[PDB]
Amino acid sequence: QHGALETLKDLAEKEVDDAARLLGEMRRGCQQAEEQLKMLIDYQNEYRSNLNMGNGIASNRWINYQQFIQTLEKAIEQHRLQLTQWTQKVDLALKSWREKKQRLQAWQTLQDRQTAAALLAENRMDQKKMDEFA
Template sequence: MTKQTALQTLIGLAQDDVDAATQRLGRVQRERGEVEKQLKALIDYREEYHVRFTESARAGMAAGNVRNFQAFIDTLDAAIEQQRRMLDQATQRVEAAKPEWARSKQKLGSYEVLQTRQDAVQARKEARRDQRDSDEFAARALRMRTSPL
């Protein structure tokens, strides 16, 4: 088992941060999607209700029914406006989570670049050591062949 370096520990911690930021971003995006879906449902319902009212009004309608319709439409309009505000807030939460996710991703990338550089330096050292060992072995073999027995 290899010993974990400080850089590998930092990479692990940074990966945990990226995972957490990704989960937060995903959660706020899902929440925004739900709020948007609810807003669309309210708007669609209002349009359907308005169409039904218009058809009923053409056939003649009592004044009390018109007032009830207008009161219900006003209630729907208020709910739609509230849902729009909630959508704006949800969008702001998504936009606030994006830079946090990007920063954590960039930090992880920086550590990974450092790890890649460190791995390359280590590989060059090992290659030099292997070459030196190979050269020493070849020189020893040549000496043994050329030395009298």
Template sequence: MSKHFPIKTLIDLAQNDVDSAAKQLGRVQRERADVEAQLEALIRYRDEYHASFSQSAQTGMPAGNWRNFQAFIDTLDMAIEQQRRLLATATSRVEAAKPEWQRQKRKLGSYEVLQARGDAAEARVLARREQRDADEHAAKMLRMRHENVN
């Protein structure tokens, strides 16, 4: 029914933009999830290492081992802090990608509404034309019957 080729072209372009924005959003969401998983793994490893070391330290240990442990924990803490910064950056990217995807969805929705309105207007014109043709046919039949009666 639709003869609205320009709007169809706009809808196709807008759909491509939505798809592209959705892919970008999905990519940054996956990246954020990966960064978050790495952070959780680092925290878990630090906690496990700390617990294991604390348990072995209860039986006594040389001062050198204690310094090595503290240096390693400090290194892990720095890695955790760096990963937290990466997570904050990844979260910012996700938050920046969401509005673009939403904007593209709204634009596509607007074009689809315009197309629906155009299709409805076209349907109304067609219905009026069909009604007019039916009325003309009925009038013609009535005239023919009237002529045949006379």
């Protein structure tokens, strides 16, 4: 039953829908990666703003401080990297959706012309039969 344009338009439409969902997944992922990174940086600042006791007595504190900050910075670097990765994925998913969206419009335009051609053909053949016989 399908036709030339319709089958191709249907595929393009599906590609568009697929691309939009992919874009949605990438965006949600990028937003979550940023929230996770954000939480770590806040944890860091609160931990810092807080670092205000003794000398060698609170030496264990200086030590704990150094170890933790290094561990936290490590986490922050990895999450920053992850955000960079999600960001790139969003950019690509967005570009992909845009072009498939443009491909779909192109098939839509062809169909509109087909609707035109068909209506025009019907108009001519339905009266040709009774125009000349006049």
